[PDB]
Design a protein around this nucleic acid. Structure first.
Ligand code: CL
Ligand code: CL
Ligand code: CL
Ligand code: MG
Ligand code: MG
Ligand code: RB
Ligand code: RB
Ligand code: RB
Ligand code: RB
Length: 136
RNA sequence: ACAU
DNA sequence: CGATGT
């Protein structure tokens, strides 16, 4: 209904899908960029959205912050809830890095706790999430 | 259909 | 127009 302004917003950006993937997290209220991942040569939109949420969880936990996380990705929200990224991307030498990061993010979820609410950013009502890359 |  | 996902 209403935006929770005291939150972290995350989003993926890419060049192609599959293609070069990056992600970032921003303060929803101010747009300040709080973290940005260096581009990964091949990944999917959904793998990047998943990594962005998990990085957000780790970032907030390290800082003892109870803020929620907004994501626009129905898929990634579910994958984090399930602790399992059900990507179709081929596992081969070209995709080794993205898959290593996804495997490591799942591993973190299976070995740590968090209370962070993971909320759907309601793009249809609110416009683009504040972490968006402005590329579409 | 919906979400990217 | 193409892709990734539930
Ligand atoms: Cl990562
Ligand atoms: Cl909340
Ligand atoms: Cl959702
Ligand atoms: Mg997104
Ligand atoms: Mg975006
Ligand atoms: Rb802590
Ligand atoms: Rb975009
Ligand atoms: Rb979107
Ligand atoms: Rb589809």
């Amino acid at each position: 209904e209403e935006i929770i302004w005291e939150s972290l917003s995350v989003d993926v950006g890419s060049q192609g899908n599959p293609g070069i993937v990056e992600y970032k997290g921003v303060d929803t209220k101010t747009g300040e960029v709080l973290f940005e991942r260096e581009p990964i040569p091949i990944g999917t939109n959904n793998m990047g959205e998943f990594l962005a949420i998990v990085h957000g969880l780790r970032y907030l936990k390290e800082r003892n912050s109870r803020k929620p996380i907004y994501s626009d990705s129905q898929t990634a929200i579910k994958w984090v809830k399930d602790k399992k990224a059900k990507s179709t991307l081929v596992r081969n030498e070209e995709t080794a890095l993205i898959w290593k990061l996804v495997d490591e993010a799942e591993e973190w979820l299976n070995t740590h706790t968090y209370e962070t609410p993971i909320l759907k950013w309601q793009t249809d009502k609110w416009g683009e999430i504040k972490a968006d890359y402005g590329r579409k």
